[PDB]
Ligand binder design. Structure first.
Ligand SMILES: COc1ccc(CO/N=C2/C=C/C=C\[C@H]3O[C@@H]3C[C@@H](C)OC(=O)c3c(O)cc(O)cc3C2)cc1
Length: 214
């Protein structure tokens, strides 16, 4: 169903090319944020749905939200949602994996100069993160599993989370931004991008800003 079956061994070189392709094809780099919000919206839909039959699934994190937390000190942009979350197996599948179907369609679409604006539907959207970031940490907690951290920059690694604060449920993406892409820690820019590709989202998109007072 996906490239290299599922397993990812001695294939760091591929991540560079996909990153190089996506960095060359997508000159408007703000679309990484649109894909994050779209991923988070889908995650919230799934837990809301399965909470209709079994409302006890919402007790881990009662509220359903998307939250963007720019960390100016650490040069990190954090995007958290309270969706269904990801087990260890789910993290390995969704993160860093390529689908032969999507890539073949993506590559072929590039050949004919066809509309590739919607990156998510080629199963390749993961590497849009590397448009703005040099490293990525994914913290996730699924009701049926413990909290795990997936991170790469590349070598993939899923580590049991024994340090970060506890998420009730859901996923947090920590983006270590490139030195030229720090514009995405600023409030104005974030609202600009969110306002663009977020009209149709049914969940609140919250922005946490720390400003000094005069
Ligand atoms: C910035 O661009 C990209 C980042 C990562 C990827 C590859 O990970 N793909 C994802 C798929 C999301 C689509 C539907 C989901 O409801 C299912 C729950 C679970 C499977 O998904 C998530 O928890 C989740 C999230 O809450 C939040 C996320 O940001 C991602 C993801 C994980 C692709 C693009």
């Amino acid at each position: 169903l996906y490239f290299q079956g599922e397993t990812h061994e001695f294939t760091a070189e591929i991540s560079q090319l996909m990153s190089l392709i996506i960095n060359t094809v997508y000159s408007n780099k703000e679309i990484f944020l649109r894909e994050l919000i779209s991923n988070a919206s889908d995650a919230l839909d799934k837990i809301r749905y399965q909470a209709l039959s079994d409302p006890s699934q919402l007790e881990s994190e009662p509220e359903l939200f998307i939250r963007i937390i720019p960390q100016k000190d650490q040069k990190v942009l954090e995007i958290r949602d309270s969706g269904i979350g990801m087990t260890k197996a789910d993290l390995v599948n969704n993160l860093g994996t390529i689908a032969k179907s999507g890539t073949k369609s993506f590559m072929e679409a590039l050949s004919a100069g066809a509309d590739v604006s919607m990156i998510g539907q080629f199963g390749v959207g993961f590497y849009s993160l590397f448009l703005v970031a040099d490293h990525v940490q994914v913290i996730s907690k699924h009701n049926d599993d413990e909290q795990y951290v997936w991170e790469s920059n590349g070598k993939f690694t899923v580590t049991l989370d024994e340090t970060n604060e506890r998420l009730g449920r859901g996923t947090m993406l920590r983006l270590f931004l490139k030195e030229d892409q720090l514009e995405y820690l600023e409030e104005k820019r974030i609202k600009e991008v969110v306002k663009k590709h977020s009209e149709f989202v049914a969940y609140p998109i919250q922005l946490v800003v720390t400003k000094e007072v005069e």
